[PDB]
Design a protein around this ligand. Structure first.
Ligand code: DMA
Ligand code: DMA
Ligand code: DMA
Ligand code: DMA
Ligand SMILES: [Mg+2]
Ligand SMILES: [Mg+2]
Ligand SMILES: [Mg+2]
Ligand SMILES: [Mg+2]
Ligand SMILES: [Mg+2]
Ligand SMILES: [Mg+2]
Lengths: 331, 342
């Protein structure tokens, strides 16, 4: 499989780069806490995409290593803060930073990550350009995260999350939110591959579009799982209207059913019977199959952009992996 | 007509405008109030004033130093947003903190936003790649100083890392290292960045940095003296505040620990480690500090850095306003008011 193969090919050099940028100026008694997040594993799909994109358009991958490190560091920076925000105890089967070291320690670590990202930016072939792209993409992620949280129906005490809670969450709102929270960084992973080794603006734009559509399809599929399992109803227990199946259901359910699903989502604690009841409501408008169809739409869009990129065989394999093409179709 | 009020009048409108411009790039209407809050709660803006006064001293112009002035003040506020989360601070500048008004998690989204606004400002400076590196270094310095400050505490934290990595001993050298990072570096940067914005003179840039660093260290030491002995005049400022907050990273405490005998050293540390430090514990701790004259030694240490700041400042042309700001920053009048006491 393509991910194992590129991990065996690129993995050691990616990991070296991550530790390298993080270690600059890093005090010895802070080293364990700072490196923890990049030592807990993870798929590294994003840096592999960046390196495969560079290899595709130029036949070289090493010049894109700084970009690959930036994208994976941005990913982990967002995870560290998201774990604090969501009070996540476990990720990749291991304790989170906030869990192992503390919420406040995790904040000092997230601060360190962003400056390690800047060191990496300065080590790219086009520092001023990557500096701008990084600011834009991290603002997209932050805004996506804000919307994801404001799309919850309950569960937060922050005066801001309570007061600014969105009254209604449409399918268009859902798609805008995932494009920012998940799409933008995958789009960046692909585009930065290209920018690292080429000045062809049209190839960089096509890589971006490709990565954006792949990232949207990826999130949609993730949402279907996070409703229908490999537990069951994770996103329902977390009160999320910003989930593809829920969003789709809300756009079809009748008045009574809609009100009731929202009621269930807004419950301070969601129990088994509530999850089964909510899912039944989803299935009653075929929300699962419609969400699956929306994923296929973005997969097909990603394919159209990918066609503009030369030597794209490996990226095509990565795409199938990312959008979990095999599993979705099986379903 | 004090220098801070004078410079607020001259620079303030443009500074405030710059802060808002960089924060507002890409900012969603429903997030706007939460993000601009930290810069609308006021603040003395000493750092950007220093930046703009340094640029003006060396070149006669301050406007080209606006992006850098925005950077330094954004970093200042960025660090404040997270420090308030970390310390669970309810109030600052007499208003609710960001975390207080909007929530701890909302404040994280705000801090994340502040750092990208800083990067927008970096890219708007005259030497974007030079400024981008300096910003990375100064923020790491601040994060490191903040880390040490916390690990130099004696109790009061529930993070496993803050408890298990807490330092066994805190010397006066550790203390100075920590405050140079936590407080000195950003004031060093403020002055250096003013010069960088308008001059390629590397020797002038280095003098400004060294000047700002010494000034920042002197300022922190005087602040430490106050956060032990209290402000005689300012209302309801508690005696022994840094004692109640379990700080060994306070100039008076570190001086004391370096001189006190073992019995006395042990007792001071027992007191700092109390979960809740009683009024009577404070009085006993202060007596321990006074027993080795730790207060006057801290004030002497502040004089040393003030004097170092002046030596560096003498290398900078047209430095009259910077001299006034130095006197403000290190609270010269107050520190000399205390030593004309005895
Ligand atoms: C927004 C989102 C789905 C984050 C998880 O990404 P991932 O599946 O790439 O996680 P990991 O880094 O653990 O592979
Ligand atoms: C951008 C980012 C870090 C998203 C994580 O979102 P989440 O909390 O919905 O996902 P997870 O369940 O992986 O924490
Ligand atoms: C870390 C540190 C020494 C902060 C000083 O705050 P300040 O006196 O500059 O506060 P403000 O920004 O409110 O004027
Ligand atoms: C770098 C930074 C923002 C330090 C804050 O210092 P502190 O928590 O010791 O005091 P305060 O919260 O009053 O600034
Ligand atoms: Mg999460
Ligand atoms: Mg989340
Ligand atoms: Mg999910
Ligand atoms: Mg504080
Ligand atoms: Mg603090
Ligand atoms: Mg103090």
């Amino acid at each position: 499989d393509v991910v194992s193969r590129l991990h065996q090919k690129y993995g050691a050099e990616v990991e070296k780069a991550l530790v390298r940028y993080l270690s600059i100026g890093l005090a010895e008694d802070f080293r364990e806490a700072v490196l923890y997040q990049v030592k807990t594993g993870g798929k590294r799909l994003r840096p592999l995409l960046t390196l495969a994109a560079a290899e595709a358009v130029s036949g070289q991958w090493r010049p894109a290593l700084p970009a690959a490190a930036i994208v994976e560091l941005i990913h982990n920076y967002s995870l560290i803060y998201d774990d604090i925000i969501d009070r996540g105890d476990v990720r990749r089967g291991l304790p989170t930073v906030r869990k192992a070291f503390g919420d406040n320690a995790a904040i000092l670590v997230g601060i360190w990550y962003r400056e390690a990202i800047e060191e990496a930016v300065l080590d790219t072939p086009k520092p001023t350009l990557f500096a701008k792209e990084v600011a834009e993409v991290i603002k997209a992620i932050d805004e996506g995260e804000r919307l994801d949280i404001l799309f919850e129906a309950a569960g937060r005490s922050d005066p801001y999350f309570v007061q600014a809670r969105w009254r209604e969450v449409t399918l268009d709102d859902y798609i805008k939110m995932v494009s920012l929270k998940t799409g933008a960084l995958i789009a960046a992973a692909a585009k930065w591959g290209v920018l690292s080794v080429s000045d062809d603006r049209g190839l960089a734009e096509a890589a971006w579009n490709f990565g954006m559509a792949a990232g949207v399809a990826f999130q949609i599929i993730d949402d279907v799982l996070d409703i229908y399992g490999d537990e069951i109803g994770k996103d329902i227990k977390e009160h999320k209207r910003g989930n593809a199946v829920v969003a789709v259901a809300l756009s079809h359910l009748g008045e009574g059913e809609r009100r009731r699903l929202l009621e269930i989502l807004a419950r301070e604690v969601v129990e088994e019977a509530d999850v089964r009841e909510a899912v039944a409501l989803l299935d009653s408008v075929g929300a699962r199959e419609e969400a699956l169809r929306l994923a296929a739409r973005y997969r097909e869009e990603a394919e159209r952009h990918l066609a503009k990129i030369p030597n794209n065989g490996t990226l095509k394999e990565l795409l199938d992996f990312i959008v979990a093409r095999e599993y979705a179709e099986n379903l």
